[PDB]
Amino acid sequence: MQNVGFIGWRGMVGSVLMQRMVEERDFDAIRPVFFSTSQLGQAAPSFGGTTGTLQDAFDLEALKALDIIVTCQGGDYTNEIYPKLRESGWQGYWIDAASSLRMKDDAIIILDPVNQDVITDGLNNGIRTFVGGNCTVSLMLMSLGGLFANDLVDWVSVATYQAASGGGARHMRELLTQMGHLYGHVADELATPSSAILDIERKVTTLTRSGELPVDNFGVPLAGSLIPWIDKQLDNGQSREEWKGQAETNKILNTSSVIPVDGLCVRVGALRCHSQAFTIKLKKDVSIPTVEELLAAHNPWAKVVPNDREITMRELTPAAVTGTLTTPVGRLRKLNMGPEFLSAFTVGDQLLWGAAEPLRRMLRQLA
Amino acid sequence: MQNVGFIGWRGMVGSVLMQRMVEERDFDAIRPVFFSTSQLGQAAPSFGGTTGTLQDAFDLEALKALDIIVTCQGGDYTNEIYPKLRESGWQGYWIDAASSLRMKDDAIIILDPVNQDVITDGLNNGIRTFVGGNCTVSLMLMSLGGLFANDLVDWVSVATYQAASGGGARHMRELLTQMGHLYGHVADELATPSSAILDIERKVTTLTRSGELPVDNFGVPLAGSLIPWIDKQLDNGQSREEWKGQAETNKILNTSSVIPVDGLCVRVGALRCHSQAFTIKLKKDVSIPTVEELLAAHNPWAKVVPNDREITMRELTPAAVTGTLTTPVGRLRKLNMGPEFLSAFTVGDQLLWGAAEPLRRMLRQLA
């Protein structure tokens, strides 16, 4: 049995990972060791039917004793610990959810249902660092994997509807709380049938701009609004979120020719699901039936939602997808621009395939 | 003074119209006659100053007696009344918010800041029917008018984030009520700092699918979600909202060559503002500072928000636009696919330029 250490397993992403591992009984085949900074010496979570004690996440000697490290602790932690281990000669496997190491030449971005070939090769070539890809790119490739796998993509233009979970636990609470303020502010008139909507809307619009809304985490209001800018501004005018699309998609698929991927990343009032609108340029005129076939064939999670009104409203929404491993694709049809212009709308839970799932699957291969 | 008849001036769109006409004192240069389907014969509102009474909206004689008819009543009304009045020989002016007559050869889609030239031509070529354009297209053109005016657009791919006001006053109340349900369901947990975010989320996700959420108007939940399908399903796999994109843009602009306009229309948890993400292909490599100048110079409502993080967060959002006449454009830059690819994000109030404002302005041109 491999000695696998877990860091940040009590965080939001870490908690989902634990849930998933318990659910898949991933703890049976390994010897889990839980790390922390707080309740040291105190009994481990015992998820792995283990009766051990919590280790010091910053004790290098304890980390070096591991065969595999799985962290959902974050970039600050990865940035402090990873180089110390590598430089100390540690050659165990490092599985990470943080973006820190994604673009390193000795690290592979993991999304096995999409790039197991890249993973296996790297494995056979000494790569011992596997990093999960950005939630947006990860969900996109899980849904449109069949198109890429068949080398049908010339370029991709995206428009996202990103969930608060991408920001974090505090962000999600902030979104729900604002929903509370907005409704509570007009609770009575909403209960009065004769009340005028313009009177109701007037009050909520005013409250939204008043400054009373709790916006510590997002900076500005999210409930009833949206924010067309996700994280750091770059010189080319992209936000770091938009920049990842091309960099990560191409590194994951391990392309030879760069596939242009760009668009606008928008934060919306959803909790865990990221929905994406696509304008995909195909290299050849492929029929929609053929397209639906390739897509559905790539993996079991890419559920193709027929392009019909009723079923779309039922299945292609955050409401239908939250908490599930399904990454549906719908609204597939050709755009007026031409037979080579394809439209697609995807939805996917940010914390599963967009965060914890890829990590869980990789450990399994190393177990 | 022209005798102007108002139909459905008590509905939501009609109420905004009445509010705007009062703000600009548009009732002074006209003889307003207020109609109703409800109680007739009763006194008229004092917005018009008149000491008149409410007439019968279905009384063809009373309607024939007018010089101009401004109705926010709806397609059903229009489909019955309009053809009758036209058949009885009525040549007065008919200003409609409903989409019914938009594509008639004897009608012009009005958005004067964008196509005044066309409104004047038809106004000289015997056109007596002017209809407001689809909220999505009106707003797009108000923000992106500069690029179109200068004939720089090859095609346009859109991904919209549409507000509930587009659906109606019931839809807006439904959205807000849903926010109340979601929050109330986890009100206590949110108030408990120590509560687990995943428990809070699990509760909300289950409630959303419980069927306990009032969804009479949108069919499925909207709060915390989104619906990638708006209105009737067309045979080309396009929804009617998506179909209006190319149909209305070209008629409004009265193009000599069809400009392809297509994409996905999505309903989101917003009250009055429609936001839209664009991938615009330009006919020629134009610089961003230029594009910025062309857009800002087309009309005073097309505010160009610099492609910078802080201001974008504060100025290019529904929170910053609801209730104003401003139709901002931001996130302008070249996409990875090439220098002829322009990205743009716009926000606009659905009830003003998207509904009431074009009518008010047209009426003012005929007084």
From Swiss-Prot, chains A, B:
CDD domains: ASADH_C_bac_like, VcASADH1_like_N. One of its GO terms (biological process) is lysine biosynthetic process via diaminopimelate. It holds the Pfam family Semialdhyde_dh. GO terms for molecular function: aspartate-semialdehyde dehydrogenase activity; NAD binding; NADP binding; protein dimerization activity. Gene3D superfamilies: Dihydrodipicolinate Reductase, domain 2 (3.30.360.10), NAD(P)-binding Rossmann-like Domain (3.40.50.720). Is inhibited by L- and D-cystine, and by other cystine derivatives, via the formation of a covalently bound cysteine at the active site Cys-135. Belongs to the aspartate-semialdehyde dehydrogenase family. NCBIfam families: asd_gamma, PRK06598.1. This is Aspartate-semialdehyde dehydrogenase. The lineage of its organism: Bacteria, Pseudomonadati, Pseudomonadota, Gammaproteobacteria, Enterobacterales. The gene is asd.
